[PDB]
Amino acid sequence: MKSDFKFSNLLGTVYRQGNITFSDDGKQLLSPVGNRVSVFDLINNKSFTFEYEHRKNIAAIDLNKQGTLLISIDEDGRAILVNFKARNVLHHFNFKEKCSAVKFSPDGRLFALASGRFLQIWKTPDVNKDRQFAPFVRHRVHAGHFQDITSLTWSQDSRFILTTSKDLSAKIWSVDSEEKNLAATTFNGHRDYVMGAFFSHDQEKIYTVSKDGAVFVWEFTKKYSWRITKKHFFYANQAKVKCVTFHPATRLLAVGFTSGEFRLYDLPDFTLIQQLSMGQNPVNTVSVNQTGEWLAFGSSKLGQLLVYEWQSESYILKQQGHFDSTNSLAYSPDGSRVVTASEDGKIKVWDITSGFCLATFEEHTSSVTAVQFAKRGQVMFSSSLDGTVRAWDLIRYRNFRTFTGTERIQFNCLAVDPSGEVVCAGSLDNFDIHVWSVQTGQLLDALSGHEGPVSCLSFSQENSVLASASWDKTIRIWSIFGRSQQVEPIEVYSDVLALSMRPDGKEVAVSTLKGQISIFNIEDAKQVGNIDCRKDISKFFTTIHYSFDGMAIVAGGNNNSICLYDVPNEVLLKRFIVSRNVRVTSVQFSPTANAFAAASTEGLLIYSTNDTILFDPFDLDVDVTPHSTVEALREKQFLNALVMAFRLNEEYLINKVYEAIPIKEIPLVASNIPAIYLPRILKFIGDFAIESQHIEFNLIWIKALLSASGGYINEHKYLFSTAMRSIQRFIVRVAKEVVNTTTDNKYTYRFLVST
Amino acid sequence: MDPRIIVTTSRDPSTRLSQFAKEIKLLFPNAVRLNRGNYVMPNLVDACKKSGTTDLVVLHEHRGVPTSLTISHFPHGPTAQFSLHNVVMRHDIINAGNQSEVNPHLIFDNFTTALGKRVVCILKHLFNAGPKKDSERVITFANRGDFISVRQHVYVRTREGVEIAEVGPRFEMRLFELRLGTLE
Amino acid sequence: FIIKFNHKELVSQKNEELKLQINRVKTELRSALKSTEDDLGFNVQGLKFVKQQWN
Amino acid sequence: DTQVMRTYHIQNREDYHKYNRICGDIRRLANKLSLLPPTDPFRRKHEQLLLDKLYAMGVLTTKSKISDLENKVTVSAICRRRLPVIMHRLKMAETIQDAVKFIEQGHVRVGPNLINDPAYLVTRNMEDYVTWV
Amino acid sequence: ILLMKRCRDWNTNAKTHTIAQRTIRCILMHHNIAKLSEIPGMVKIVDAIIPYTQRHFTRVDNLVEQSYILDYAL
Amino acid sequence: ELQKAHSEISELYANLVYKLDVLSSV
Amino acid sequence: QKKLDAEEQMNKFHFTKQLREGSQSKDYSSLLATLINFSPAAVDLEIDEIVWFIDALTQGLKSNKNFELYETFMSLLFKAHGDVIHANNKNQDIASALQNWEDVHKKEDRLDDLVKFCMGVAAFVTTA
């Protein structure tokens, strides 16, 4: 593996503060985090743009009128421009001062920034290529006010700017030096502090709201001038109106509270439509869709990290969690679901291929320390600081058992067999290791062998060997299923915390008490010790994992860095997190061989092996044209089209050279493929299958290949392990579709015979 | 809960110490026979603390009075040393009758709860090997002041007659050094 | 179990009477078991639909 | 008052107020749980668990009776759970001043983690694992 | 209802439930959907039989789909 | 009464366990 | 997308011109296009005509495409109108259209056994 591994997702949605908005399409959600910007699509949540020039963690964000331009503003007053796929088109330090709000036109000509005591409006650049040192042009600026500008509103004429100010007043701005009605007349009389104003989309009602709950209505009579029309006085509501947004339907109001509840109103009626509670944590900001069908509102960082989507006919579209700093991760045996462990004592399941927050379990009394799956796909065991461990199955959602029984307040490491018979846990403050049969919770023994705190534990796929790393310079090996016990080695060096097993039972990886990470086998032949963990903005060794093909391990400490290594000596690639104020605490490796994970305090995973890179595996260009020679082998010689266009690796060719060959030709092809061109096409089918609707077509392929070379992948293991997992998830996720509905037309014909 | 007992002598046992160590081995599922290749290692504290065991038994021989038994509870550290009556030639028995997992009834005669009570706890805390708690045999601890006697008998009923069965060796010990241990 | 221990092409390699014997054996098994499969697969949804009406 | 502020190298003046509020909560818990009928096992069980967790927190290092809960829980007891006082009394440095001088500049280690805070606290069972770098 | 509660009793253990299947497929063929007009209480029954047969669905499904594997190799 | 006293004392005990638990691992 | 409808059907919490113009000839391709376009129509199939609906569906199975939506249409039809289908005592002209559905549904039975083959053989190479 050599591929360009880079961030194109993140681990759970909103940790931090910011604005929030939709696209004009109604199908794309714009919900930032503090550090980057994560724009989901509403159906099948995915990840589109990933800027990083933000040195400070706050955003202000909006798109113009079709989503071709996105900005994001942090505290300092520099902004960054992207078009559609994070080109990072333009970059622009804009201000030495912070910004409160940013607003486009519905026309894409003008541009709106509120800062300091001024108001900036800019001429918008179109989409082009680059070639501007300074792309933004100043149109006008307006002086002046008395203090800060906190909210901003645009009108439909693109001539008419309604803006509030911090000094309990509002003002009006004609854009094109018109002096619309020859008046920029102030709005006063407000007893309390102003949180927002809105201009209605019929040019006759000018709208203001205050922090107390008061709402003031002015008319377009400019006897002659402004007169009040409807007043209020609220003294018993007794909170503060935190945020406010107005409908493009021009009938409805939305009001957010610090108290933790959600208000809806009507504009000239002042009827109470609905209010909804979600907690006590304050509402930060709220924005409505362009058609009033969907509502979304964001919640503040110290309070809920939760953003709901409620409709006007009252049902919650998207609910979510995404809590704080994370302890542990593990991949499911199907490569789609990822467990997380949080500090507040929950266990949440994340479907991070598709951004759902699926399901939770809450029986913990305090923080969670360890999660890992069993290989059956049935059950998963959680470990806590509760003083006990417990079992879980997936959509039965029911607690099997809660093993404990000696007086204890701290467990720190949890590991189970592949056999599912016995569960072992290592006490951080007892010098002993615990086992339990999963049948009862009987206590078999207490295996007394250490002299320090036992701190990392794992099993083998041979499954007769227990690997037991304690924090006293001593690695130990155990027998559980024989009729005796064993002799346990001594390290040379440097107290260990991180243990990691090869899936063979033949190799053990340890992390020494410095940057040296070291490996040795089960006949203690120490292969490599490897160099430090760099990137200060002391050095550590916290987690380490053996990759599934048996050719790589991944090291993560707590120093803003993560390193790749192979089985020989060499440093492969060092990826790392840039931000500003631990980060990494857990890393494991996917069973799809496409990416892996790194549990960070921000929360960020993916590596994403892609195929945009020109690899030349077996002398690619002696097959001179990728087009015309392949065009010759689409007419003739379908054995040679596979070997020719397979040495080539344009993904824009493999669809056609793979599709075009006929059905009867397929067993003749699979019977005559070379054994060296096998795994990349077995991995190609396992990830091309999940996309298209060619189920019959790919299924006759996998019949031919799996029918062809069964013993060869039986003996030449540990790569077709990964590929075989990738095809098996497609097989089960299509089988449980068509067996269900084919049953649902299998009852029908005999149900006709009934009566 | 039930203890883990280790038995150990000097590097040079004869037959008379061998068969004696074979009888003292017969207090299992937790009694194990073991010699040292040095005389007594000073690393036995790391041996028991690392192994997690609770109790230790040492057989040796001195010339202040003749031959000596030693019992110690390991983590706290009380240690009773006792003197024996006869070490000359016992019965060559390593297992006969039942197994030693059978928890017998335990008999103390001549109740002295003034200052021998710490002894009477330890003999309770030693002979609880096994999950049985139901009597098949019996072991007798006879005080005669500072002379105690040890017996092993099996229930032999005959026409509902409570007849004893003498089996094993017959001991008679005296309180030798008992070092004042700690809460540590 | 006896197919996974040992074997069909690790005890002999010839197109013989045991090889074609196994073909009719497994056809008998898959038919006779598919019968019970179809009977149950009609039985269950036969039971559901009356609970659909006993509202 | 400021005798305590000057004895234990407190970097602030706020810390005496904060620990005063926590000890006030412990005393009013003690008084409210005290005024029950003394055969009610609620009172016996909860004062017992409060005793055991205050064993573990190292504040009542002394093995105690019930009436010690009014008596000994002060600010200076929890102030003796601060790191450099554990460091001095474990005979590493020479004064409390020089212990704070070492923790200001990174040479002290509890467990496998670096420490640079003079307000980290130690248990009665974490202080076995204190060394240098 | 007297036979049908014996079907409830016979759906419990494995390897016999098949016999308890056979009459059930009979009776829906020989009576109408109303379970002819005057009908006693058996909602506990018709509730009870569904999870057992749903459970026996998957086992014979696995024997069937694994039975093809001994043919499908050679 | 007695049940009320068990209510408020179990409340302050639940709060106090939290306040000491903040200092327990920090 | 292919998960969206099959999860979308289980519910946890004009068009009248075209079907009658398909009552005249075989114009149900545009009708199946307005079925495949948008609007989960669990209320729209509940607002005679059921025969032309089944003939529309047999034109749906006639092409070798979009069976994953079509099977869901068929089963939802037997969830919603399943009494008017039943007619209390069957074999009206309804059952002729069901008979038109039966044999082509017997034609589409082949795909399941292949899935059993790959699932069990892949399970064997996973084990062995």
Number of separate helices (H) and strands (E) present in chain C? 2, 0
Q: Hey, of F23, F25, F26, which one would you mutate to test binding to chain D, going by the most D CBs within 10 A of its CB?
A: F23
Q: Look at B52 and A451 and tell me if their CB atoms are within 8 Å.
A: no
Look-up: residue for tokens 């509760």?
A386
Contact check, Cβ <8 Å, G86/E73: no
Option in D112, D114, D125 nearest A497 (CB): D112
Chain A segment 594-653 residues within 8 A of C by beta carbon are: none
Does C46 contact E22 at a Cβ distance shorter than 8 Å? no
Regarding beta strands D113-114 and A586-589, do their DSSP bridges make them parallel or antiparallel, or are they unpaired?
Answer: unpaired
Which helix (DSSP H) or strand (DSSP E) does residue A474 occupy? strand A474-478
Q: Compute the distance between CA of residue B97 and CA of residue B102 in angstroms, rounded to an integer.
A: 11
Query: Cβ–Cβ contacts within 10 Å for residue A598, how many?
Result: 24
Q: How far apart are CA A408 and CA A599, in angstroms?
A: 28
From CA A24, how far away is CA A16, in angstroms rounded? 24
Cα A484 off chain centre by: 48
DSSP E strand boundaries for A127-224:
137-141, 152-154, 160-165, 169-174, 194-199, 205-210, 215-219
Beta bridge partners of A416: A423
Task: List, in sequence order, the alpha helices (H) in A535-583.
Answer: none
- Angle CA A306–A310–A313, to nearest 5: 165
Interface of G with E in 3-22 (CB under 8 A): none
Q: CA F17, F19, F23, F26 torsion: positive or negative?
A: positive
In angstroms, the first-to-last Cα distance of chain B is 19
Nearest to A527 by CA among A562, A553, A549: A553
CB F13 within 8 A of CB D46: yes
Instruction: Count CB neighbours of A105 within 10 A.
Output: 19
Cis peptide before A144 (omega within 30 of 0): yes
Way the structure was solved: cryo-EM
3-state secondary structure (DSSP) of residue A527:
strand
β-pairing, B5-9 with A596-599? unpaired
Chain-chain contact of D125 with A497 (C-beta, under 8 angstroms)? no
Asked if the Cβ–Cβ distance from E29 to A753 is below 8 Å, we say: yes
Chains that touch D (3 or more CB pairs under 8 A): A, F
Q: Using DSSP, how many helices (H) and how many strands (E) does chain B show?
A: 3, 11
Spatial CA neighbour of A297 closest among A259, A267, A325, A257: A257
Query: Do the Cβ atoms of A751 and C38 come within 8 Å?
Result: no
Cα gap A277→A396, rounded to integer Å: 29
Reduced to 3 states (helix: H, G, I; strand: E, B; else coil), residue C47 is: helix
Look at A753 and E33 and tell me if their CB atoms are within 8 Å: no
**DSSP three-state, residue A714:** helix
**Minimal Cα distance from A735: which residue of G?**
G115
Closest CA to A515 of A538, A541, A491, A535: A541
Which positions in chain A touch B49 (Cβ < 8 Å)?
A: 451
**Cβ <8 Å between F13 and D32:** no
In sign, the C-alpha dihedral spanning E9, E12, E15, E17 is positive
Angle at A693 between CA A692 and CA A694, to 5 degrees: 95
G121 contacts in chain E (CB < 8 Å): 69, 72-73
Contact E72 A707 (CB under 8 A): yes
Task: Yes or no: say if A599 and A587 are a contact pair by the CB < 8 Å rule.
Answer: yes
Contact yes or no for E54 and C44 at CB 8 A:
yes
A431 CB within 8 Å of a chain D CB? no
Full DSSP string of B112-141: --SSSHHHHHHHHHHS--SS--S-SEEEEE
- Token digits of residue B156: 């032999």
For D65, residues 6+ apart whose C-beta sits below 8 A from its C-beta are none
DSSP A228-247: -------SSS-S-EEEEEE-
**B125: Cβ–Cβ under 8 A, 6 or more apart, which residues?**
B3, B73
Alpha-carbon distances of D35 from A107, D32, D70, rounded to whole Å:
74, 6, 13
Cis peptide before B29 (omega within 30 of 0): yes
Asked if A755's CB is within 8 angstroms of E32's CB, the reply is yes
In angstroms, the CA E57 to CA E51 distance is 10
Q: How many Cα atoms within 13 Å fall on the side-chain side of residue A207?
A: 25
| Residue of B37, B14, B28 lying closest to B88 (CA atoms) | B14
Burial class (CB in 10 A: 0-12, 13-18, 19+), A477: middle
What are the tokens at A718? 């540990």
Go through D28-66 and write b for each residue having 16 or more CB atoms within 10 A of its CB, e for each that does not.
Answer: ebbeebeebeeeeeebeebbeebbebbeebbbbeeeeeb
Tokens representing A96 are: 């030495």
Provide the token pair at B68: 């000596």
In angstroms, the separation between the Cα of residue A708 and the nearest Cα of chain E is: 9
- Taking CB atoms and an 8 Å limit, are E73 and A710 in contact across chains? yes
Strands B55-60 and B5-9: parallel
Q: Write down which chains contact chain B via at least 3 CB pairs under 8 A.
A: A
- Identify the three-state secondary structure at position A436: strand
Identify residue E49 by its one-letter amino acid code: I
User: Which positions in chain A touch D112 (Cβ < 8 Å)?
Assistant: 471, 495, 497, 513, 540
Which residues in chain A have their CB less than 8 angstroms from residue C41's CB?
A: 743, 746-747
Q: How many Å lie between the alpha carbon of G83 and the closest alpha carbon of chain C?
A: 9
Among the listed residues B5, B11, B58, B25, the one whose alpha carbon sits nearest the alpha carbon of residue B169: B25
Using CA atoms, how far residue D74 sits from A76, D19, D31, in Å, is: 47, 9, 15
How many Å lie between the alpha carbon of C30 and the closest alpha carbon of chain E?
6
Separation in Å, CA A334 to CA A377, A392, A732, B105? 8, 17, 10, 59
Alpha-carbon B143 to chain mean position: 16
What angle (nearest 5°) sits at the alpha carbon of residue A553, between those of residues A531 and A547? 180
Residue pairs between chains A and D whose CB atoms are closer than 8 Å: 8
Q: Which residues pair with B40 in a beta bridge?
A: none
Neighbouring chains of A at 3+ CB pairs under 8 Å are B, C, D, E, G
Residues 6+ apart with CB under 8 A from A588: A329, A330, A331, A545, A596, A597
Helix, strand or coil for residue B14? Answer: coil
Type of residue found at E65: E
Residue A288: exposed, middle, or buried by beta-carbon count in 10 A (0-12, 13-18, 19+)? Answer: buried
Question: Do the Cβ atoms of A71 and A62 come closer than 8 Å?
Answer: yes
Q: Report the alpha-carbon distance of residue A228 to residue A162 in Å, rounded.
A: 18
Q: Do G82 and C52 touch (CB under 8 A)?
A: yes
In chain B, the residue whose alpha carbon lies closest to the alpha carbon of A445 is: B1
Q: How far C36 CA sits from the closest chain E CA (Å)?
A: 8
Residue A735 CB partners (closer than 8 Å, separation 6+): G115, G119
A99 and A112 in contact (C-beta within 8 Å)? no
Write out the two tokens for E28: 């829906």
CA G115 to chain E, closest CA, distance in angstroms equals 9
Locate all alpha helices (DSSP H) within A453-610, ordered by sequence: none
**How many Cα atoms occupy the beta-carbon half-sphere of A320 within 13 Å?**
26
- Does residue A331 sit in helix, strand or coil? strand
Tokens at residue B67, please? 């031959």
CA dist A80 to A93, A123, A133, B140, Å? 8, 16, 14, 91
Q: Which residue of C has its CA nearest to E47?
A: C51
Do A727 and A733 contact (CB within 8 A), yes or no?
no
Measured distance CA(G46)–CA(G76) in Å, rounded = 11
* Strand duo A308-311 + A294-299: pairing: antiparallel
**With contacts defined as CB-CB under 8 Å, which chain A residues touch G109?**
742
CA–CA distance, A688 with A694 (Å, rounded to integer): 10
Q: How far is CA A241 from CA A22, A215, G57, in A?
A: 23, 11, 55
Question: Which positions 35-94 of G are in contact with E (Cβ < 8 Å)?
Answer: 86
What end-to-end distance do the CA atoms of chain A give, in Å? Answer: 63
C 24-43: CB under 8 A from A: 38, 41-42
Which chains, if any, share at least 3 CB pairs under 8 A with chain F? D
> What is d(CA E35, CA E45) in angstroms, rounded to the nearest whole number?
13
Q: C-G interface: how many C-beta pairs under 8 angstroms?
A: 6
Q: How many CB pairs under 8 A join C and E?
A: 63
A267 vs A264: CA distance, rounded Å: 10
Distances (CA, A) of B135 to B108, B127, B164, D130: 15, 13, 13, 52
**Nearest one of A88, A5, A9 to A48, comparing CA atoms:** A9
Q: Which two tokens stand for residue A168?
A: 């309990």
Distances (CA, A) of B149 to A287, B24, B122, B141, B162: 92, 16, 16, 6, 21
Give per-residue burial for C10-32: e unless 16+ CB within 10 Å, then b. Answer: eeeeeeeeeeeeeeeebeeebee
Give the separation between CA A423 and CA B100, rounded to whole angstroms: 32
- Please give the interface size between A and B, counted as residue pairs whose CB atoms are below 8 Å apart: 10
User: Is the Cβ pair D120, F26 closer than 8 Å?
Assistant: yes
Q: Is B6 helix (H, G, I), strand (E, B) or coil?
A: strand
* DSSP-assigned beta bridge partners for residue A140: A121
CB contact under 8 A, F16 and D25: yes
Burial of residue A10 (CB within 10 Å: 0-12, 13-18, 19+) is buried
3-state helix/strand/coil string of A638-677: HHHHHHHHHHCCCHHHHHHHHHCCCCCCHHHHHHCCCCCC
Nearest to A222 by CA among A187, A254, A195, A253: A187
Whether the Cβ atoms of residue A588 and residue A332 lie closer than 8 Å to each other: no
In total, chain C counts a number of residues equal to 55
Mode of pairing for the β-strands spanning B105-109 and B137-143: parallel
Q: Which DSSP helix (H) or strand (E) runs through A29?
A: strand A28-30
**CB-based contacts of B123, cutoff 8 Å, min separation 6:** B106, B108, B141
Beta carbons within 8 Å of A554's beta carbon, 6+ residues apart:
A544, A545, A547, A562, A563, A564, A565, A587, A589, A596, A598
* Alpha-carbon distance values, A210 to A155, A287, A411, B136 (Å): 21, 18, 53, 90
Q: Which residue has the tokens 């805390």?
A: B125
Structure-token pair, residue A302: 């110290």
Half-sphere exposure of D19 (CA within 13 A, CB side): 23
Residue A672's alpha-carbon distances to A104, A181, A640, A644, in angstroms, are 61, 83, 10, 14
For residue A125, the Cα-to-chain-centroid distance in whole angstroms is: 31
Q: CA G54, CA G84: separation in Å to the nearest integer?
A: 14
CB-CB under 8 Å, G105 with A745: yes
Contact A/E (≥3 CB pairs under 8 Å) = yes
**Do the bridges between strand B5-9 and strand B31-33 make them parallel or antiparallel, or are there none, so unpaired?**
parallel
- Percent helix, strand and coil across chain B, each to the nearest 5: 15, 30, 50
Other CB atoms within a 10 A radius of the CB of residue A716 amount to 13
CB contacts, 8 Å: A540 with chain D: 112
Interface test with E, best of G116, G124, G127 (most E CBs within 10 A): G116
- Helix H or strand E segment including A521: strand A517-521
- Chain D nearest CA to F14, separation (Å): 11
Interface touch D32/F19, C-beta < 8 Å = no
* Distance between CA atoms of residues A50 and A8, nearest Å: 7
**Position B91, amino acid:** H
The resolution of the experimental structure, rounded to one decimal in Å, is 4.5
CB A196 within 8 A of CB A229: no
Instruction: Determine phi and psi for A437, rounding to 5 degrees.
Output: -75, 135
Could you give the CA distance from residue A512 to residue B148 in angstroms, rounded to a whole number? 57
G94/G85 Cα distance (integer angstroms): 7
